[PDB]
Amino acid sequence: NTIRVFLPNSQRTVVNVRNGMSLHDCLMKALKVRGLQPECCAVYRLQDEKKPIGWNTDAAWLIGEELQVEFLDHVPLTT
Numbered sequence: 001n002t003i004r005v006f007l008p009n010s011q012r013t014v015v016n017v018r019n020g021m022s023l024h025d026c027l028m029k030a031l032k033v034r035g036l037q038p039e040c041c042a043v044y045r046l047q048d049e050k051k052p053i054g055w056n057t058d059a060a061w062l063i064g065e066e067l068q069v070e071f072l073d074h075v076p077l078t079t
Contacts (some may be wrong), residue, residue: 006068007048013045017059026059026071034068044068048068 005013005027013030024038031038043057044050046066053067 003028003062003064007031007036008068008069008071017063019060021059022055023057023059023062023067024051024055030065031069040072042070042072043060044070 001017002014003017003026007013011034013028013034015026015077017026023043027038027043031041039056043053043061044056044067045053046068048070
């Protein structure tokens with residue numbers, strides 16, 4: 001019921017997956033503790049290679065896998 005998440009600066013954390021959680025809601029608290037926001041990051045699925053996935057991914061399908069979170073490049077937004 002957990003996902004292993006590799007963070008920038010050689011950090012790591014374990015997140016619990018409740019039924020129906022999106023990746024955003026799943027990693028929200030753990031990133032906030034590190035002082036990070038998910039919408040300012042990119043997330044990858046580690047297989048064998050970094051494959052990109054969206055923050056609206058259903059996290060229940062990723063239980064038991066390893067993820068990697070990277071900072072987005074600092075480019076201005078239209079938001």
